[PDB]
From a paper:
[name] generally exist on low-copy number plasmids where they contribute to plasmid segregation and stable inheritance. Here we report the discovery and characterization of two chromosome-encoded [name] (cParMs) from the genomes of Desulfitobacterium hafniense (Dh-cParM1) and [name] (Cb-cParM). Both cParMs form filaments, exhibit nucleotide hydrolysis, and possess characteristic [name] subunit structures.
Numbering used by the authors:
A (entry chain E), B (entry chain C), C (entry chain A), D (entry chain B), E (entry chain D): 1 to 285
Write the structure that this text describes.
């Protein structure tokens, strides 16, 4: 019956199933006093509280206590009393160097937890994993897949690039770059003011406008990434579909690019799962 | 029907219900001669007289004979012949490590007393507890909750800090510091004069002016607390709402701070209960 | 209509009503020959003669045949043909451990007597009792009650201490010490001369100067009492109002004290009743 | 040469030196007629008679005319013609807030008296003070000090608690509770019979059996104290050595407790001084 | 002249200088009555008592009142009248994110204190800081540094890992894991018995044997940590030198491991400072 996609993302984690949505990738298993005021889950001796704590730009998100979080995300797309579901997962392209163990450490198994006191264990019917960013391919319609295209997922730490022909990949790339390197470059001198701010809290302070950043620096980042991608791809060729949340940093300037064929996908951040679902049906149905 | 908040505070206890107000947290069950000249209550073998005696900076205010006092406070916000009320209580953030027992030692139970000869037992409809200092959150209007803020309760022994985003907490802290450590630092040398005075009676002697204290020492305390809070919070960020009575020590200098967005809440001392009441309705109504 | 205060004092008893004054607390129901030359009253089989006899420093002045005396005192403040009056009484702080019975043994009752042949019984409208020494509080004006003060009744056997804030008590104490312990300490060696004199007749012999006492011994007593009171009160704080007759032993040296704010109340001996009357009106009016 | 411990206790005072023993803590300097029939001592204008009078549950036993008594106790452990001895004293844990003055008001000084006409002044070689209740520690043998223990002095007004590891303290506590609060709770209704009896004379009437008390009320007191001590100590841990005279109220039920390791020390009342003596040697020898 | 290493450790703090040793990291500036019975120091308004109180697993040990403690530790390795010494300090690897301020808040400065009344201020000649755990490197002899090795400091909250080639680091890691997570996992169900015990007091109760723990659970913890470390290091490679006190939890099973080359360093707990001293000489000499 039931199908689910959980995408682990860069800044957020992502659930779609009986319910849809996402939430922050931040994790705390560090100090904890007010159990009742925070989302919480305990499993196999790991007690974690969801959407707050430490994130520290680390690799191995698929091994460092994300389990709880992942389970939580599945509970988000699922009901509070679920026991069996079929699983589509995703990981960024490069990180797939860790697929195997994960799969057999999860495949068709049941896992416990305490979350918020609901405290139930859930079995999974089957796991099938896709490259994060790539799955947007299937969300594409033949309106552009009939021609060569470029799935271009601007994630906050990353840019994942899938250069595709009609009904097939042509090339792939991924460079750990994105809005964080911009935040850090901006902080290299804005924090040198004598101010205590970081790339982690920066986006909030621009959201409220307590501090602001020049647009031409956004343009500098755009130019840098364009220069980086030139050797592999001719962006004018391979009509480019921008996905991920970092595309929403810059849609305003991306639309201003001199390129011939491109577009920031509506709900660009969530498009990849939208295609991962075409794939999900193609397996289960 | 009826709702009540009793906040146990640092120096005072706090009642709001059929009646509103507060009174000193001082307790005597030590010598007692003139029963008629003091507020008095006896319950379960504990005879206590209200607003005078020993306070001694002790933890466990929620276990050391405060019962009588607490009951008294409820009688203050209530009529003299009450028998059933619904209870919202509060405790400082850290002290919640003692919630559980208290709740089930009180939940939906009836308790006796002798107070001043009125000598009635009263049932409670339900208890629901909030972190003291945090509840000011709800007293906030969207005029500032729409932006990230910092509930900053300067209590006499404590500073409780709740760093909040729009409609949610971001971080929390609490350091047992306040006007008492200032009194003690001042007494470390002013009492070294060869004078018999203490942090307990000091505030009275400055109220009458029998002895006075330099303002720059208030500024030293302000600088010390600001240095203490720096690692967690950027005070310029998270527009700071000062609450509690110790904020009334220093409003005159707090307004002089170089911060961008801040304010000493009107009735800052009582704001936390004012929000605890938004919460009270959100449960009962 | 009518109000009366009878204060039982240490050495004297005290009447104010239709008439004002006081007289010695000495009692004789021991030998009696010349009925006509002494004040006399018989009631309920107790025949007593007023202002002479035995006093012997005994407690329970409110149970040992003072009745006659008390009645006499009421007759002093009253007319010789009185039948109904409203009663304010007073007892020293500690002695209130005996209030209850007295009250209901007197409340709203009529009592007979023979005094000097006038031999009438009188009803009392109501009794209301105050701590002797404390009532001086009400005789105070806002000129000093606006600040923290100390009602300090030096009675001959006692020092009663009421430490007050604005419009309320802060602490209380009472130590059975006074000019008698000075007389006894002086007699411990002056009577050791081989001389037949006692603390009872001593004050007369210094009044006529037949024997005299060094002032520095008065100062020794002052220093001793000051050392005794130190743990409870900072005399420089709580502006001290001296009351009672033993304050008139030492006014000359009390004015010489190094204290910041103090005063021997004019008519210090009678001030306590002067305030007991503010209280009397506050009940009856 | 000579060593002495005088322990001031709750109900009794305690002397060990050239002689050993104890006697009641009751004091009278109030009326006195038959000098010859009572133990008596006069010093510095204070005339007192030993083991009878007023006790009134008051703090400051180390300032309120105990001097005479204390001297008497030293005379008890000493000969009738002593002039120089070395002093170990003790006070309850909390009361040590008064150490300093006492020490320098006594240290290496000579003090007079009249006692019973022996009327000699005695010098003291040195004072060294220990927490009453704690000194039982040293009376312990390595048979249990090798393991963590709990010196548990049940004094009549108090329970003093010293939680110790091997050769060191771990925690301490003291709550003014004991057999008096039981007497008062029992009197709250047994005296409400319409009977004239008090906690002061109660123990005698149960000693002669003129009135008796249910054992289950002893058990109620035991349960109350056990509930009180739970937050600090796990009684099963820290093998508990009961000391003081109130432990002799209940040894019969203490032995019935479900605890794993505990014992009422033989001569439990006097054990603390027995250890204070190990300490005494460790100073003098 | 003089050199000192103070290592702040996980459970203890560590001093070597004119004197050597360590003591508990526990801190109390909370209630304090018996000043004389506890180690004590006051500096800049902070009064602290050493080796007892609150520890609460908190970060920022290098900012939360450890100053006093740190000073105390220096006094431990130093004489009681020291005024100038050269400083080598250490902090855990991760915590170095706080180096800078500490250094310049201490570098070449003089600091006061009251400790136990010795109450002297001491200057420091220079500070130089090393990663705790890493310094064991220098304590190594060429007998194993000639080959690739792994400094493996099992601290109670932590495992610090320094993977080294000949005369140089190859990689580093640190995971906040250790005997505490074992205590907490054991308490998750052993305290669920209905028993009042915690990870803080657990080790004592196993030291005295009042409660005991299965060895296979130690083996479970060992297996968990080994699984955790696999991605970074091949333990068979990089001959592993176990250091810290948590290595002394398990030496008995560590020796049983199937590894080819490893050893629990003699005085494993103190080895890191032993190498920090090779470094100390390499600076000063
Ligand atoms: N301006 C704007 N930025 C957004 C929005 N949603 C997400 N983002 C940005 O997305 C960035 C986070 O990384 P992403 O670009 O989303 O990369 P990702 O792999 O999709 O990571 P996930 O968000 O977890 O799916 C942050 O810089 C966000 O500010 C949005 O609605 N508006
Ligand atoms: N100057 C001034 N200080 C006040 C006033 N009201 C309360 N305070 C101060 O408040 C301090 C007591 O602790 P609080 O700051 O009130 O902390 P709290 O947790 O709110 O404790 P509670 O007063 O019981 O609610 C004392 O130092 C008081 O002087 C006021 O109206 N004026
Ligand atoms: N020198 C002097 N002493 C007075 C005078 N009036 C009363 N006394 C003293 O008062 C002492 C008696 O005890 P009080 O001090 O009056 O104590 P009290 O509780 O007020 O007792 P009462 O006199 O009955 O009201 C005696 O030592 C008197 O000498 C006075 O006018 N001059
Ligand atoms: N049943 C019984 N009770 C005793 C005995 N000796 C002392 N007590 C009790 O001890 C209580 C008095 O207080 P304690 O428990 O002795 O406390 P303390 O601090 O040791 O006071 P001291 O007796 O002066 O040393 C009273 O309730 C006595 O009844 C005894 O031999 N038998
Ligand atoms: N069994 C045993 N354990 C020890 C010994 N010494 C220290 N420990 C353990 O060490 C642990 C505390 O943390 P450590 O492993 O020492 O970590 P650390 O960073 O070295 O902290 P410090 O002890 O302060 O140096 C506790 O679990 C102790 O039981 C010992 O001699 N025997």
């Amino acid at each position: 019956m039931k199908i689910t996609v959980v995408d682990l993302g860069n800044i957020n984690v992502k659930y779609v199933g009986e319910n849809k949505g996402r939430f922050s990738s931040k994790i705390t298993n560090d100090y904890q006093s007010y159990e009742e005021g925070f989302q919480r889950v305990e499993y196999n001796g790991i007690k974690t509280y969801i959407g707050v704590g430490e994130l520290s730009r680390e690799f191995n998100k698929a091994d460092r206590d994300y389990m709880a979080q992942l389970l939580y995300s599945l509970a988000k797309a699922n009901t509070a009393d679920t026991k069996e579901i079929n699983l589509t997962l995703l990981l960024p392209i490069i990180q797939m160097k860790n697929k195997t163990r994960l799969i057999e450490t999860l495949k068709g198994e049941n896992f416990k937890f305490k979350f918020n006191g609901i405290d139930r264990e859930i079995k999974i019917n089957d796991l099938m994993v896709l490259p994060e960013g790539y799955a947007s391919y299937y969300s594409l319609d033949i309106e552009n897949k009939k021609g060569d295209v470029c799935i271009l997922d601007l994630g906050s730490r990353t840019i994942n690039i899938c250069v595709l022909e009609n009904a097939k990949i042509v090339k792939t790339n991924t460079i750990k770059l994105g809005s964080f390197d911009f935040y850090s470059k901006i902080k290299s001198l804005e924090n040198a003011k004598g101010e205590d701010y970081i790339e982690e809290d920066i986006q909030r302070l621009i959201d409220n406008g307590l501090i602001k950043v020049d647009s031409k620096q956004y343009i500098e980042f755009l130019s840098d990434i364009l220069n980086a991608v030139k050797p592999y791809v001719n962006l004018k060729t391979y009509n480019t579909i921008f996905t991920g949340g970092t595309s929403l940093m810059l849609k305003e300037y991306i639309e201003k690019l001199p390129l011939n064929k491109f577009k920031v996908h509506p709900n660009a951040l969530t498009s990849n799962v939208d295609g991962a679902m075409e794939a999900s049906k193609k397996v289960w149905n």
